[PDB]
Design a protein around this ligand. Structure first.
Ligand SMILES: [Mn+2]
Ligand SMILES: [Mn+2]
Ligand SMILES: [Mn+2]
Ligand SMILES: [Mn+2]
Lengths: 494, 495, 495
């Protein structure tokens, strides 16, 4: 699932206090931007925009940055002193993520060269502080990275942020197609699409399942054959799911459902969607392998109408570069002292991008939805550092909840388990993470990711103006409880 | 649509200072009072007297009982004597039922002749009801306060007004709403938080696939269509081509189908309101039209394009109105004729016949919207008189109830080309100002219009549900209204 | 001082999506769990299985029953399966009983061989509980959350600790406090708002003149004194002068007289806590002393000088402590010996013998304070080990519970000229920092000292009551703590 050619504008501040210094500032910036496009750490193209010098110049490049659908964020560096009142109109206008790069062109103080002319020119030490003030003063969410522009860690911090900014750009235009209403009587998948569209840009809208049913009925048995070809190209088949076997019908249906979905979603420029098993009129099966393959392509998905998680999965997939990110649900607990684990799955819908094992197409009965035995990819999830993120609506506001977890390889086979699954050990413990999660009103539905950092989901939440609360090795429940209370008083009316 | 046999618990507060005999005389007064009110037997909901409360345990048990009692629509509290109000804290903190504080007195007049420390000791409501007043205000509880002698008629009118609001509230707490399809796509004001709504009003709002209604209408007996088309004929004129064997009696048949499949679903689930969306009618011959208007008539809430907020409100307001003169309504177009400025309200089809001046007429007309077969609908002219046009919207953090007082006017000219039931109103204070105030209140295009709900009832409901009620009437000026929106915003946030 | 036969309601949530037999599996899992938890007299409060709740009406019924039940001290909810939480909103909104969300699972371990969707459909708590977790948070209602397998020992300890908090909470709800006299004049911290206290904690705090007490103390017969003296002899050492036919014994007997009058008065009114004031002892021979220590040992709350908050807090903490290691206490003087900094805790007379390490000794000594006759009191050395020192103060707009974690220490040195029961502790983290943190928090000089009540139980009680709980322990930094106070203040305002 293709991105738009997303670029970050490097904006360098000065004022007027000569043209010769202004051109030294300019080449410094261009050099920095040119060597960033050639450092393999920096994930999207940086564009030198201007040395900005005047209010009208600051405001123009900020207006330009809003209108530029390809501008994902703006990186500001005050090379010289840049009297920050000049910046007010621009910053008031800026609505693209902001990195304040607090840097210096030169790394070391030239101890014998150090003169008033050098100092007059390389002023960021204070020029970035005066800008710091102005951005803090207007209450604006921004990223602040301090270091020499060549620094390896600066590089790593800047790209982590850049992935987040790209996730936010996709967020601004993000169209979510829901095929059915929320699973009846369910609270946490409910919330305010208007707030969500105001807060995150998400477009979330209902299509009757009729409208998907209609477009699955319109797929050629020919085009199903092309896709089965490419299923044989990718996936193991369970005895009876390969060509001719008694269950391959089921696989064909999911290939049908898959291609009807891709058609609907590609037509409407949707990057995420939800289904609801409670409403499967005109569908042979609850979508499963179809969804699993669409998530792998880079599509957000949420079960039982869960547009928040659907959107969250697309965004985190954008943050992760497509890798090791799935829709996820906490299905059961392994409480063994010393080996406490959560088994994470869904009815069918786990993205193969988290798979440790080569995915296998299987067909098994699924009571839930009263439809035909769904085909689905079955795998063991990978191992290592991951985040389990839920975005809930508290009514007045959204709260992003991120749990740091360690996914573990199953030691034991689960041969009667018909769904792809992942085992994780939540930090700081099952007992404590689950408790902090529940107190935070974390959903059952999460986006799980091996490739999104805590810092990225925090930066995303900063960009969107929502609370993000993190459960990890350092979380204690008493301290967490208090952080919820204090965040609440900060975040109400914001 | 039957109400539960809702009742109203009279609770009379006293202490022990005065004795057991005073407490019997207090019980007697209270029973005479409840008994007179019930004899005047026209009012649909009885007052059930609940023995005199004198202890925190007594106060607390009745308030727990009242909470459990599905019949209990509200509690009417009266301090006959000083009933020291700290006693009431346990009860008041338990009470989740609409409270009326009836600030009354058994005798009307100071019996100047005989008035002695015995009478002053027994007829203490003057201070008793104030002591209780402080306590209810201190706990930040919403209550109605009706002051006057219990036999006063304005007391009767205010209490009955409130009781109808209390019963509407009670319907609200259990209110189940079926949604056939999602909101009309890209629409804002019909969108909202169903969890906030359930928490705040008790409405259960859950979506059923349109297929779930289509399956139910496919099952509707070609025969039972026939038995209903018989009821149609009995009630409603048929437009030429729509009656008996005419080339559009199918349209009417297909609405009787939908009417019976809708009612099957809604009766099965105990649903007292529903929503349809023209954007999702897979398995339907027509957008429910005649079907929906009939269902509104017998008391169902309805909202179009998945508008559950208005569906619930149409339901609540229909219950407040005693089933009468209450409809789902949309502002469709304006008459801007200076001195004759009016709003024409309709919907594509779904206008309740309970607001009809002219006997409704089954007609079938094309409807582009939805790309389905020519829907049958009842067409009629709305009544006239004082009415309320009420929107309930989701500001994101809380709900706002917006009531515009309007005057529905008998139409001067015919709208013979207009295939939908319709109504004209002049909104107070003016079209210019109401519509401006309405827009600044962010009022929906979807409303419940009612000839029978008072402003005071919708305020009373808002107070009961702890939501802002903004009212646009003859006294509204936009400068003030704006300020009141700003000051209300600061009071209502996180409540 | 007997408790109601309090019980905890285990409520299991499911629905219908897996069938009526999957519901029987759930019901049988929960019955096992409840039976297993009741099995031994492990605990004075049983768990009661409440049939699985699967509908809004079921969930509302059990929460309404829970509230109405005087025996039900708390509800323990567990989502065995997905139990869509909109169903729970109506229920949760009614529940004014301590909620513990037990996030558990019937099986400890994933049965790796057999785990199939029959199993993943039934043991879904991993998500069931989170969906419920969201609803409870969303309603912002206070709850304990305990994760862990139901047979896990840590789970049992926590559930037992919370259970004791909830019973204390239940006692708080009907807690009746008698004040014999008003606040000590000009004292601030013992002052507060009895109305806010009733609303937030459930305490009925009311003033008797001491005449009421003296009167009842006078009506005590010389024979009831004689029988209680005989009980004193069996329990306590009499100091030389204090035994029958000693010159001081009359002082003891007058304490015996006060103990009997007080007990009569307190039992008559169902009072479980009381206050005296040395400033108002008209009709009394002595400041109540031995009598008060005795009444505290029986489980009564006491606060001196009209301190009803502490009195109530002492009753609550005694219930939490299961009547053990819990007294009214005051900070009397400081040992500032560097390396050996400790607080000497006492009161004029009123220290509960339940914190006694040594056999309490009836002593008669002069007491200037109140200008009455040489009161008899139990004198003893407080126990040693981990303890909490709790002040509940009124900040004006809300209560604040302050808990200092201390280490009671055996006195190295005799204090043979100190006529009062006393205890030493080392306040955590240091005398320097605890006293500073305590002063910044406005901690009272009057505390409930307890060997048995844990920081988490009081924190749990605070959660329950919706008041700030501030804890000073080994982890406390005075800089961090002043910020926690500012931030707490902002949250707790208007709540
Ligand atoms: Mn799910
Ligand atoms: Mn909301
Ligand atoms: Mn409409
Ligand atoms: Mn004292």
């Amino acid at each position: 699932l293709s991105l738009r050619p997303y670029e970050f504008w490097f904006v360098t501040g000065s004022q007027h206090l000569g043209e010769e210094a202004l051109k030294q500032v300019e080449e410094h910036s261009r050099i920095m931007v040119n060597e960033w496009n050639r450092d393999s750490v920096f994930p999207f193209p940086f564009v030198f925009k201007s040395v900005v010098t005047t209010p009208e110049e600051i405001r123009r490049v900020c207006l330009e940055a809003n209108a530029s659908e390809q501008c994902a964020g703006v990186v500001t560096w005050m090379h010289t002193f840049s009297p920050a009142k000049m910046w007010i109109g621009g910053l008031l206008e800026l609505r693209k993520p902001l990195l304040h790069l607090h840097t210096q062109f030169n790394r070391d103080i030239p101890w014998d060269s150090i003169d008033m002319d050098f100092m007059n020119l390389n002023q960021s030490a204070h020029g970035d502080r005066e800008f710091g003030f102005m951005v803090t003063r207007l209450g604006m969410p921004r990223k602040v990275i301090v270091g020499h522009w060549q620094d390896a860690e600066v590089a790593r911090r800047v790209r982590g942020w850049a992935m987040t900014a790209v996730a936010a750009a996709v967020s601004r235009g993000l169209k979510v197609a829901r095929f059915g209403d929320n699973m009846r009587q369910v609270a946490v998948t409910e919330g305010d699409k208007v707030e969500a569209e105001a807060r995150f840009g998400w477009s979330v809208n209902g299509y009757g399942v009729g409208d998907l049913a209609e477009r699955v009925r319109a797929v050629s048995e020919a085009e199903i054959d092309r896709l089965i070809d490419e299923y044989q190209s990718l996936y193991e088949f369970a005895p009876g799911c390969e060509k001719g076997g008694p269950l391959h019908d089921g696989v064909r249906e999911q290939a049908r459902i898959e291609l009807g979905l891709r058609s609907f979603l590609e037509e409407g420029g949707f990057e995420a969607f939800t289904t609801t098993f409670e409403d499967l009129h005109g569908m042979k099966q609850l979508p499963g392998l179809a969804v699993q393959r669409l998530m792998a392509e880079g599509y957000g998905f949420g079960g039982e109408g869960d547009w928040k998680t659907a959107a969250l999965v697309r965004l985190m997939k954008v943050m992760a570069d497509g890798k090791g990110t799935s829709f996820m649900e906490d299905y059961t607990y392994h409480f063994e002292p010393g080996n406490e684990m959560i088994l994470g799955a869904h009815m069918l819908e786990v993205c193969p991008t988290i798979a440790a094992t080569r995915p296998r197409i299987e067909v098994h009965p699924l009571s839930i939805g009263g439809k035909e035995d769904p085909a689905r990819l079955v795998f063991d999830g990978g191992e290592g550092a991951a985040v389990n993120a839920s975005l809930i609506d508290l009514g007045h506001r959204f709260r992003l909840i991120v749990n740091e977890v360690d996914a573990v390889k199953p030691e034991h086979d689960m041969p009667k388990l018909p769904v792809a699954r992942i085992l994780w050990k939540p930090r700081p413990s099952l007992r404590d993470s689950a408790e902090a999660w529940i107190l935070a009103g974390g959903a059952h539905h999460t986006c799980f990711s091996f490739a999104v950092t805590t810092e990225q989901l925090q930066d995303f939440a900063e960009m969107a103006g929502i609370e993000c609360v993190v459960i990890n090795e350092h979380t204690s429940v008493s301290s967490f409880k208090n952080e919820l209370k204090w965040n609440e008083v900060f975040w109400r009316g914001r």
